[PDB]
Each structure stands twice: as C-alpha cells, then as structure tokens.
Amino acid sequence: MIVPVRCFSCGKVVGDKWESYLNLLQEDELDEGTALSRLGLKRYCCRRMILTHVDLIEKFLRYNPLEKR
Amino acid sequence: KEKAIPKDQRATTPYMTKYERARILGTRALQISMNAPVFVDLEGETDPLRIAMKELAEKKIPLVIRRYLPDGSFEDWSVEELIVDL
Amino acid sequence: SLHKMSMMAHRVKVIPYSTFRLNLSVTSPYNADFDGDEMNLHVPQSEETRAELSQL
Amino acid sequence: MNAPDRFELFLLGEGESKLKIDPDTKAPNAVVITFEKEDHTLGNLIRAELLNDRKVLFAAYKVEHPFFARFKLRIQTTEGYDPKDALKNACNSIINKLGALKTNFETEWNLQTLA
Amino acid sequence: TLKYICAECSSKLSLSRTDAVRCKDCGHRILLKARTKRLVQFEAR
Amino acid sequence: NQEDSMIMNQSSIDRGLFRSLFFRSYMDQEKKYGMSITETFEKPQRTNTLRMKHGTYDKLDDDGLIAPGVRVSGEDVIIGKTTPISPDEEELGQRTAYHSKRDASTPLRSTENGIVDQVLVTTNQDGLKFVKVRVRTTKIPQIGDKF
Amino acid sequence: SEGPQVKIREASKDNVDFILSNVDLAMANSLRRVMIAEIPTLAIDSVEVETNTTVLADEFIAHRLGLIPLQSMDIEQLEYSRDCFCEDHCDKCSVVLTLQAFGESESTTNVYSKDLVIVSNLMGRNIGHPIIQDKEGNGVLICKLRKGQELKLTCVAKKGIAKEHAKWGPAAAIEFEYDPWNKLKHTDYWYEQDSAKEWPQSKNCEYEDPPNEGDPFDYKAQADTFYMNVESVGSIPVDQVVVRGIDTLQKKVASILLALTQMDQD
Amino acid sequence: RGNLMGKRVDFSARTVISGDPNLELDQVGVPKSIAKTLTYPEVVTPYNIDRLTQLV
Ligand SMILES: [Mg+2]
Ligand SMILES: [Zn+2]
Ligand SMILES: [Zn+2]
Ligand SMILES: [Zn+2]
C-alpha cells in the first residue's frame, strides 16, 4: 500500500527514495531505468522494489477520516 | 468334543502366521502392562512390547493358538511348538 | 485411500511448525504431493492395536 | 501456531550445555562432539581447520535437521593425540588467523580517503 | 454512558442503554464505537 | 522443494514479503421473541447469568461490546448478550433464585486471534439493535501456505 | 601479521570493496555469514499505540518502524534486555523514541523517520538516532496523513541480531567471488556452442592472469584471494561491519574454547 | 454406509503434509500442537512409575 522500507531480497533501504524517484520521473523527464540507476539501485532485486510498487495509500487517503479530532 | 482335533492328526501349518505373531505379541504386551509375571530375564527393558518380543524369542509365552476351520473344528497349537521363521 | 498402502503405520517424531512431514520415497504409495494435500493421523489406544499396528 | 521462538537458534537453554563430548566406538581414538545453538558457520570453519592438522585422521560435521540449531563433529586423531587437544589447536589457529585479519584490514582501511 | 461516533458526519456522541441508536445531529442510524483509550502493545516484527 | 514444494527466504519474510491482513466480521442481533421475551447486549455476571462460557468477559463494556483497538484471542467474548429464562427448569443444579438470565454471548473463533478493528451499532429493517465487530490479524508465510 | 592479507580497491561510507588473500574458503564464508546474521544492532522492537486514525493498521505501522535503521555505533555499551535486571526496560538496555504526527494541512502530510524523537537518557552514547541518508534530510517515508488524522505512538529500541529477525541486520547484499577464470574447475559451464563466448567475463578477471592456454590442469591449487564487497544499511559504518564481523567470529571460537576448558575441570 | 460402515472417530488429526529429506522412511513428523491434543492411555507399571509421575 505504501513503499516498503527495505528490499525484500537484500534489505537495502528503499523507503527513502520513493519521492526522489517520482520527482526524477516528473520534473527531470527521465526514463524509469535511468532514474533507478541515478538513485543508486543497481541490483535488479532493488530495482523491482521501486519499479513495481503500487501506491495505494494515495487512493485510501481520498476517503474522509472515520474519526476526526 | 468332536471339534477338537487330536494332536496326532493336526494338518495345519507348523509355522506361526504373521497375524498369530501380531496378536500374541499384543496379547502378551497387554498382559505385561497389567503386571503379569514375566518368565524371561530382563537385562534392562521397560516397553511391554519389547519384553514380549524377548519372551517370544526365548519361547516363554504360556499361550496356545486355537486355529479354527471353516466347519467349526479347531486345532490347538502352543506358542512354544510353533516355528517363528517369518 | 484406494489400496492398503494408502494406510501405513509410522513412528512419531514431534516437530516444530504446523505441517505433517514424511519421507519422499513414501509419496508414491500414498499418491501424494506437497501442493496442499492433507493427510489423516490415527492414534491407537491399546497395547493390542498398538502392537498390531507396528507388526502388520 | 507452532513456530519456535527465533532466540532458540543462538540462546542456549536451561539444563543445556554448549558442548557434549562422547566417545565413538566405531573406530579407535575417535570422538563425537555435539555443538548446541550453532550452525554451518562454526562447523565448516572448525572442520576445515582440523583437516590441516597432520595428526588428524578424520574430520566431518553434519547438521542432522535444519529445524534445530545443533551440529555434530566427529574427530579421529592418531594414537597418542587427544581429539580434544586437536579441537583446542584448531580453535587457537582460527583465533590467531582472525586476529591477524582484523589488524590487516584496519591498517589498510586507515590508508583510504573517501570514507 | 459510552461514546460513539457517527459514520457520516463524524460527530462524537454519548449514548446510554435507553437512548436510541441514531445521530442526534444529522440523523444517521450507524454509529462507530470509539477506539479504546488504553495503550496497546505491538511487536515490530 | 521436492514434489511441488518450495523454499522461502526467512529474511524476505521478515521484511514483509507476501505478508497480508486478515479481517473477520461477527454479526449479532437483539431478537424479540414476541411480546414478552427479549434480549439485550450486556456484560453478564456469573451471579445472575446461567450457562456462561468458560472464556473471559473482562474486555466487554457495559454495552456488551469490546472497544476497537483491544487485542483478543481464543474463547474471548466479543459480543456479550443475555436472554431471560422461564422458571421451573433446573439443570445440573446450579440454578438458584439468584439466576434470572442466561448467556447468549458470541465468542471469538477458537483458533483465531487478533485485535478488534471496528465495532458499529445500528438497527435493522425491523428496528432491532444489531452490531458488527471486525477483528484484524496479520498472516505471515509459514511452512504450510500455498503459493 | 603474516596471515590473511587485505587490499582495499574501493572504499565508501556505504560500500567497501577489498581482496581477501592468503585465506581459506571456510574462513571467508564464515566472515560473510557472520557479517549478515550475527553483528548486534539497535532496532525498534516494541511499539505502544496511543492514537492511530491513519489508513494503515497498527501492526502494519509497527513492522515498518522496526525496519527503520537506527544508529548502532555504541551498541556494545547497551545491554540485552534478557540479560538486564529491570521489569520491562530501562536506560541500560533500551532506547525510547516517540512519534507524534498530525494532519494539520489540507495537502497530504508525510511522516518520516526524522520525526522520531529520542526521549530516553542516552548517557553520552551514540545510539538511537534514525539514519538520515538522503539529500532532502528526510528519512524513510513511514506514513501519509490527510487533514484530521493523527498518529501517536512510543517506540522501544533494543539490541539484537539478524538471526532473531532480519531487522537487526547491518549489512545489505555482500558480493563474494573467487577464481574468476575457473582454474579450479568448481563450475562446469553450461553452453550451447562455445562457453567462452556465452558467459560474460567477470570484472575481477583483470586482477588475475588468464589460463596459459594449453597447460595441464593444476590439481594442487586451493581457493584463495577472495573478492568481497560489503554493503551497509547505515546503522554502523561499513568498515565497522567487517571489523565487528571478525570480532563476532573471534568471540564465537573463543566461546567454544572456553566451554571446552569448563568441561575439563569437571 | 454413513454411520456404521464408516464413521467419525476420536483421537485423530488432519493437516497439510510436507516433505522432509531428513526423516526415516517409517518416521512421520507430527506438529507439537497436535501431539499435545492427541493422547495415549498408558498403564502404570513398576517399569514406568517414575516416567509417568514426571509427565503428570
Ligand atoms: Mg496435490
Ligand atoms: Zn535488493
Ligand atoms: Zn451524524
Ligand atoms: Zn534494563
């Protein structure tokens, strides 16, 4: 639903690169392969972690909160 | 008693069958578990089944097998006289 | 359980986790694999059936 | 649920000792040591070091089941050489080799600049 | 009394065993029991 | 991995590989048996209620519901309910003038556990009170899961 | 000193690339196994949830919090809670972090690991602080909130090893290779027409001479001169991963030696 | 057929089966939780008084 903290296979931290990945795609007009390598993700285990992630939390945040303070 | 075949004309096998051995071991194992007097020397054994196996090997099981025939007659065979070769 | 080798007697080995475990060579008589198959265990309750089970 | 607690892999339990040395009757001057809460890391390292001793005739280890963190070590030495002493010598060799390795890495690392 | 929350207007209510199950503000007929205020512990594994 | 089995990386499982949420909902209504006998959601006491389950009622509130966020386990009662009984019926003794209610509670599934996620109270088409309780639990891959 | 030899090819704060020469294969494998599974590290282990109105579950958030890398430089000055004389936890065996986030803005507000605040007495140590390893200064994206949602929880960090749970591992993938020219014939190369043309050459082939093209197989050679690259998650410096892996392995052998001595007396 | 020739029985267990290369041909791995539910009635004798006492 949200970006995983670590790569499943090797455990490298990838949860601090989602916004950097999106910004590279949007403003720098980079292809996803170049963006993945620019972020330092070399092993294809780490590349698929960020490349295949679906950000569902953005969909869940469209519903109004159940309990507002 | 016409249904008890005299020992001199018994025509059944002189060998213990697998089912006869299984019940004799289970029968004597159950008796041992119920504090039955063991007629074999134990060099260290607590499982009733193993004690029964030791008794069968040394021919110290005081039981007889009444083999039945399809007409109602039977033959009495002592566990000691039955060959355990299987 | 279409033949008598589909019911066979085994010696218990208590183990961690929530699955039964068996040797690979006994999978053909059981016609069993490990794609999700389930098997049944029955415990004898007397010395008679307990020796009968292990001797036959 | 039947998942054993993960600390059972390394934390030694109550009434359980790290080592269990029992003589082997299948051959002379042979012993089997059972290591508790250990895995291939020590077994491979210790067994390999033992095989470099000329007074050791046999050295092998096995992990009987991957569920339990214990391995057995079978050692047979030449007559007059105690297998426990062979294990002592091998362990000392590993410790001294590791000590040298640590010093060599540290002195080489201090020469770098990027980090 | 115990505290509930409306499922549409998110208004916090206080109902007794005699009060009808309904929001006194907007009129919704579904109420959510408020989360317990005692701390709950979780392992990070 | 012989014969259609597989080896999974425990490290990958630890990091969240193939981990999932499980939700289960429990439904219960306040039935009215005509004009005289009626039920209510309550936290029954052992002194006024008969046939109470061997589980624990410690987590129920005065309305007979566990508040969301509380951890539950097997045999735990999550919806407490009682119904009145007719006199002149004694079972196993144990039925004294003190007892005027009998337990009609809903216990959590014996093998399941988790944390109560949501409790909603509303009314059905006939105006009777009925509640829904949802329980969360996390399933982590183990040696019997199918992939 | 004339034992295992070390030559560092590339050093960084996240990666160290070196050649391990004059060593046995068993020692090299044990070094990487210990570096992966047995170096103590500080990580969040228990979480108390006071408020959670997010779209994520408490168990979901707790698992994420346990995977956040914390500083572990002074981890040896910390104790194991199992080996400590305290009811639940204290300042001698634990670090306490609090996370308070509210959706005050109309846009989506992101909860990072930089928002974790240490509320324990560090006693002058250097452990507990979340590792910040990016440009913007944020950490790991823990959660996202919309307006009116709140996350209030308290985290307790304890020391452990990746054998207990992978969250305590200080090392990412470890590269490990020997004999790039296959002169010991430990691999039988699968091919279709020619194996040399079909298998790309390792980058380490440049550090070793190629086979002499017609000499007899050398059956007396044993594997040595291992090429290793150790990656670090940031909880401890990468150089410390190698040094402490040697320390952990050295202690383990010493424990076997000590246990053997203890049996001798009795 | 449903109640006399075959019937549901006590002292039985069912679960998914796995393959263990490290079990003997006649061994079966039994989950620990199942082993705690299934029981065997063992008779007290002079040979098992002490072992049974510890189990109790
Ligand atoms: Mg199948
Ligand atoms: Zn990776
Ligand atoms: Zn409302
Ligand atoms: Zn403490």
UniProtKB/Swiss-Prot annotation, chain A:
**Keyword Hydrolase part of the UniProt annotation:** no
| Subcellular localization(s) per the UniProt record | Nucleus, Nucleolus
> Cross-link Glycyl lysine isopeptide (Lys-Gly) (interchain with G-Cter in ubiquitin): which residues?
59
Could you state a single Gene Ontology molecular function term? DNA-directed RNA polymerase activity
Which InterPro entries did the record assign? RNA_pol_su_RPB10, RNA_pol_suN_Zn-BS, RPABC5/Rpb10
For Zn(2+), which residues are the binding ones? 7, 10, 45-46
Please indicate if the UniProt record lists Ubl conjugation as a keyword.
yes
One GO cellular component term of this record is:
RNA polymerase III complex
Biological process, per Gene Ontology: nucleolar large rRNA transcription by RNA polymerase I; ribosome biogenesis; RNA-templated transcription; termination of RNA polymerase I transcription; termination of RNA polymerase III transcription; transcription by RNA polymerase I; transcription by RNA polymerase II; transcription by RNA polymerase III
Q: Can you tell which superkingdom this protein's organism belongs to? A: Eukaryota
Listed A to Z, the keywords are: DNA-directed RNA polymerase, Isopeptide bond, Metal-binding, Nucleus, Ribosome biogenesis, Transcription, Ubl conjugation, Zinc
User: Where's it mainly located?
Assistant: nucleus
Say which family it is in: Belongs to the archaeal Rpo10/eukaryotic RPB10 RNA polymerase subunit family.
- What more is known? Present with 5300 molecules/cell in log phase SD medium.
Read off the NCBIfam families from this record: PRK04016.1
Q: Tell me, how does this one assemble?
A: Component of the RNA polymerase I (Pol I), RNA polymerase II (Pol II) and RNA polymerase III (Pol III) complexes. Component of the RNA polymerase I (Pol I) complex consisting of 14 subunits: RPA135, RPA190, RPC40, RPA14, RPB5, RPO26, RPA43, RPB8, RPA12, RPB10, RPC19, RPC10, RPA49 and RPA34. The complex is composed of a horseshoe-shaped core containing ten subunits (RPA135, RPA190, RPB5, RPO26, RPB8, RPB10, RPC10, RPA12, RPC19 and RPC40) where RPA135 and RPA190 form the DNA-binding cleft.
From Swiss-Prot, chain E:
Zn finger region (C4-type): 6-26
Q: Which GO terms describe its cellular component?
A: cytoplasm; nucleolus; nucleoplasm; nucleus; peroxisome; RNA polymerase I complex; RNA polymerase II, core complex; RNA polymerase III complex
Which terms under GO biological process does the entry name?
nucleolar large rRNA transcription by RNA polymerase I; ribosome biogenesis; RNA-templated transcription; termination of RNA polymerase I transcription; termination of RNA polymerase III transcription; transcription by RNA polymerase I; transcription by RNA polymerase II; transcription by RNA polymerase III
Molecular function, one GO term: DNA binding
Specify the domain of life of the species encoding this protein.
Answer: Eukaryota
Keyword Endoplasmic reticulum among record annotations? no
Q: Where in the cell is it found?
A: Nucleus, Nucleolus; Peroxisome
Listed binding positions for Zn(2+) are 6, 9, 23, 26
Major location, coarse class?
nucleus
Keywords, A to Z?
A: DNA-directed RNA polymerase, Metal-binding, Nucleus, Peroxisome, Ribosome biogenesis, Transcription, Zinc, Zinc-finger
PTM section of the record: The N-terminus is blocked.
Question: What is this protein for, i.e. what is its function?
Answer: DNA-dependent RNA polymerases catalyze the transcription of DNA into RNA using the four ribonucleoside triphosphates as substrates. Common component of RNA polymerases I, II and III which synthesize ribosomal RNA precursors, mRNA precursors and many functional non-coding RNAs, and a small RNAs, such as 5S rRNA and tRNAs, respectively. RNA polymerases are composed of mobile elements that move relative to each other. In Pol II, the core element with the central large cleft comprises RPB3, RBP10, RPB11, RPB12 and regions of RPB1 and RPB2 forming the active center.
Q: Please name the gene that encodes this protein.
A: RPC10
Swiss-Prot record, chain G:
Residues annotated as transmembrane = none
Top-rank taxon: Eukaryota
**Biological processes per GO annotation:** RNA-templated transcription; termination of RNA polymerase II transcription; transcription by RNA polymerase II; transcription elongation by RNA polymerase II; transcription initiation at RNA polymerase II promoter
Q: Which residues bind Zn(2+)?
A: 84, 86, 90, 93
Keyword field contains DNA repair: no
Question: Quick check: keyword Methyltransferase in the entry?
Answer: no
Q: Which UniProt keywords apply?
A: Acetylation, DNA-directed RNA polymerase, Metal-binding, Nucleus, Transcription, Zinc
Reported effect of changing residue 7 to E?
A: Transcript termination readthrough
Could you tell me where this protein is found in the cell? Answer: Nucleus
Q: Which GO terms describe its cellular component?
A: nucleoplasm; nucleus; RNA polymerase II, core complex
Q: Name one GO molecular function term.
A: DNA-directed RNA polymerase activity
Which family does the record assign?
Answer: Belongs to the archaeal Rpo3/eukaryotic RPB3 RNA polymerase subunit family.
Function field: DNA-dependent RNA polymerase catalyzes the transcription of DNA into RNA using the four ribonucleoside triphosphates as substrates. Component of RNA polymerase II which synthesizes mRNA precursors and many functional non-coding RNAs. Pol II is the central component of the basal RNA polymerase II transcription machinery. It is composed of mobile elements that move relative to each other. RPB3 is part of the core element with the central large cleft and the clamp element that moves to open and close the cleft. Seems to be involved in transcription termination.
Q: Tell me, how does this one assemble?
A: Component of the RNA polymerase II (Pol II) complex consisting of 12 subunits.
Q: What else is known?
A: Present with 10000 molecules/cell in log phase SD medium.
Q: Which residues of the parent chain are present?
A: 4 to 268 of 318
Curated annotation (Swiss-Prot), chain H:
**Location(s) in or outside the cell:** Nucleus
* Positions of disulphide bridges: none
Q: PTM details? A: The tandem 7 residues repeats in the C-terminal domain (CTD) can be highly phosphorylated. The phosphorylation activates Pol II. Phosphorylation occurs mainly at residues 'Ser-2' and 'Ser-5' of the heptapeptide repeat. The phosphorylated form of Pol II appears to carry, on average, one phosphate per repeat. The phosphorylation state is believed to result from the balanced action of site-specific CTD kinases and phosphatases, and a 'CTD code' that specifies the position of Pol II within the transcription cycle has been proposed.
Q: Which family does it belong to?
A: Belongs to the RNA polymerase beta' chain family.
Free-text note regarding domains:
The C-terminal domain (CTD) serves as a platform for assembly of factors that regulate transcription initiation, elongation, termination and mRNA processing.
Quaternary structure annotation from Swiss-Prot or TrEMBL: Component of the RNA polymerase II (Pol II) complex consisting of 12 subunits. Interacts with DEF1; the interaction is direct and serves to bridge RPB1 to the Elongin complex in a DNA-damaged dependent manner. Interacts with the Elongin subunit ELA1. Interacts with the Elongin subunit ELC1. Interacts with ASK10. Interacts with ESS1. Interacts with RTT103. Interacts with SHE2.
The name this protein carries in UniProt is: DNA-directed RNA polymerase II subunit RPB1
Name the species this protein comes from: Saccharomyces cerevisiae (strain ATCC 204508 / S288c) (Baker's yeast)
